[PDB]
C-alpha cells in the first residue's frame, strides 16, 4: 500500500473481540490512542455488545456524543476510542461504573464497581526517563507522562495514580511474593504469586508464578502486571478469580448448575 490502512475486515480482528460472522463484512477499526491495536476495546463494541444499550451504529453515536461517558474521569466523543486494560468506565445518568479487566480466559469482562473505588487507576511503568534539566520523567502503560516521581520507582514497577488529579499515590515494588496479573498471550487473565525470576541477557526474561491452587506456569516479563502487595489485592476481583479452572469441572459445574436449576 501507499499509506496507513483505514479499514478493518470482520474476520481480520482477533478472537478477544468476540464478534459474529454474518452481520457485517467490515469491523470497527479503532482510532489511534494510548494502547496498541491488538489489545484494546473500543466504546462501540463494548456498548453495543456487552451492555446491549445500542443496537445501531447511529444509535451508539447518539449514546456517545451526548456527554454522558467518562474515560479516566474525562468526557470523550470518539466512537472508536481505544479503551484497553485497567480503564474505568463511568456513567453518571445510569449511576453505575465499570472497570476494564480481563476474565479468566482471553477476553474482557464487565465488572460493576463502587464509585469510591473509581478514583484511582493502577499503571505499569515502561521506562524511567530524565528530562532536559534533570527532571525525572515516567511513562506508564497508557503513555501518561508523569513529572517528578518517587526515586524508588524502577523500570518494571507498578504505581497507583489518582483519576481526578493525575498524581502518584501508591506504588508496589517488583519482587517475588507479590500477587500478579498476566496481560497478553495464550496464557492470559490469571491470578498468581510471583516466586521465581531468572535473567536472560539480550533475550526475553521469563518469570515463574505459582497459582493459589498450586498450578504452575511461566510467561514473558513484558506480560506481567502487579495488582497487589504480597497476597492482598488492591483491586476487587471478579467472579472466577483467575485460576484457569480446568475443562472437565466446568463440565461438572455446568451439570451441577443444570440439576440445581431443575
Amino acid at each position: 500500500a501507499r499509506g496507513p490502512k483505514k479499514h478493518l475486515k470482520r474476520v481480520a480482528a482477533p478472537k478477544h473481540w468476540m464478534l459474529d460472522k454474518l452481520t457485517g463484512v467490515f469491523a470497527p477499526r479503532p482510532s489511534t490512542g494510548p494502547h496498541k491495536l491488538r489489545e484494546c476495546l473500543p466504546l462501540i463494541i463494548f456498548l453495543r455488545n456487552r451492555l446491549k444499550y445500542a443496537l445501531t451504529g447511529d444509535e451508539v453515536k447518539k449514546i456517545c456524543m451526548q456527554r454522558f461517558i467518562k474515560i479516566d474521569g474525562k468526557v470523550r466523543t470518539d466512537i472508536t476510542y481505544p479503551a484497553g486494560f485497567m480503564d474505568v468506565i463511568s456513567i453518571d445518568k445510569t449511576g453505575e461504573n465499570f472497570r476494564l479487566i480481563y476474565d479468566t480466559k482471553g477476553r474482557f469482562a464487565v465488572h460493576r464497581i463502587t464509585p469510591e473505588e473509581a478514583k484511582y487507576k493502577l499503571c505499569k511503568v515502561r521506562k524511567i526517563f530524565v528530562g532536559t534539566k534533570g527532571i525525572p520523567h515516567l511513562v506508564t502503560h497508557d503513555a501518561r507522562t508523569i513529572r517528578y516521581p518517587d526515586p524508588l520507582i524502577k523500570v518494571n514497577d507498578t504505581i497507583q495514580i489518582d483519576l481526578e488529579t493525575g498524581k502518584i499515590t501508591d506504588f508496589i515494588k517488583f519482587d517475588t511474593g507479590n500477587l500478579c496479573m498476566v496481560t497478553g498471550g495464550a496464557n492470559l487473565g490469571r491470578i498468581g504469586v510471583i516466586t521465581n525470576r531468572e535473567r536472560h541477557p539480550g533475550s526475553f526474561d521469563v518469570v515463574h508464578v505459582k497459582d493459589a491452587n498450586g498450578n504452575s506456569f511461566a510467561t514473558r516479563l513484558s506480560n506481567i502486571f502487579v495488582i497487589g502487595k504480597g497476597n492482598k489485592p488492591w483491586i476487587s476481583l471478579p467472579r472466577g478469580k483467575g485460576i484457569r479452572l480446568t475443562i472437565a469441572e466446568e463440565r461438572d459445574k455446568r451439570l451441577a448448575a443444570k440439576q440445581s436449576s431443575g
Binding site: 470482520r10 460472522k21 454474518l22 480446568t246 475443562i247 472437565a248 463440565r251
Partner: protein, 185 residues
C-alpha cells in the same frame, strides 16, 4: 468481499461397487420394513455411523486415563444415551464399536409413530408426518428424518389443529357436507 458463509459438506456417500447382490438385498430389506424413500437416506445414515465409529477409533487409539479422551468419551456417551440409541446402564467406552444401522434408524420419527400405535402402516406414518399432524412438545414437525431424544419421547401427540385429534374438518369433508346440503334441498 461479501458476508457469506460458504460452508457445506456431503451427507451421503457412494459405495465402490455399484452392481452387487448382497448389500443391495439388505438395504432393500431395511427400506422394506422401515419405509424409506430412497437409497440416499441410508447412505447418509451409513456415513454418519462411519464418522462416529471413526471418531471412536482415534478415541480408543489414545491411551487410558487421558483427559481429552475421557472428556470426549463422556460427552459422546452422554449424547448417545440422550438420543436413545444406547441404554442408561451400559456405559462403556468400546461398546460404540458394536452397533449397527438399525440402532440409528430405530430413533427415527416414523418408527416412533408406527410403534406408538397412532398410525396404521409405515407408509401411512410417513404420509401423516409429511402432512404436519403431530405436535412434539407443542411444536408442529414436518420432517420425516427427525431424531427423537429419549426425554422428548412421551410428548408425541396429534396436533391441536388437525381433524384427526380434534379440530376443524378439512377441505374434503366440508365439500362433502356442502354437496350433501346442496342435494338435500
Amino acid at each position: 468481499p461479501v458476508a457469506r458463509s460458504w460452508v457445506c459438506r456431503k451427507t451421503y456417500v457412494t459405495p465402490r461397487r455399484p452392481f452387487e447382490k448382497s448389500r443391495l438385498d439388505q438395504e432393500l430389506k431395511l427400506i422394506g420394513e422401515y419405509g424409506l424413500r430412497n437409497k440416499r437416506e441410508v447412505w447418509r445414515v451409513k456415513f454418519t455411523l462411519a464418522k462416529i465409529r471413526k471418531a471412536a477409533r482415534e478415541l480408543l487409539t489414545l491411551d487410558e486415563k487421558d483427559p481429552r479422551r475421557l472428556f470426549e468419551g463422556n460427552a459422546l456417551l452422554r449424547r448417545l444415551v440422550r438420543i436413545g440409541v444406547l441404554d442408561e446402564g451400559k456405559m462403556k467406552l468400546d461398546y460404540i464399536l458394536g452397533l449397527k444401522i438399525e440402532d440409528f434408524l430405530e430413533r427415527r420419527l416414523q418408527t416412533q409413530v408406527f410403534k406408538l400405535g397412532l398410525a396404521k402402516s409405515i407408509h401411512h406414518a410417513r404420509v401423516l408426518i409429511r402432512q404436519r399432524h403431530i405436535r412434539v412438545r407443542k411444536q408442529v414437525v414436518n420432517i420425516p428424518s427427525f431424531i427423537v431424544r429419549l426425554d422428548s419421547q412421551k410428548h408425541i401427540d396429534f396436533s391441536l389443529r388437525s381433524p384427526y385429534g380434534g379440530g376443524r374438518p378439512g377441505r374434503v369433508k366440508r365439500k362433502n357436507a356442502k354437496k350433501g346440503q346442496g342435494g338435500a334441498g
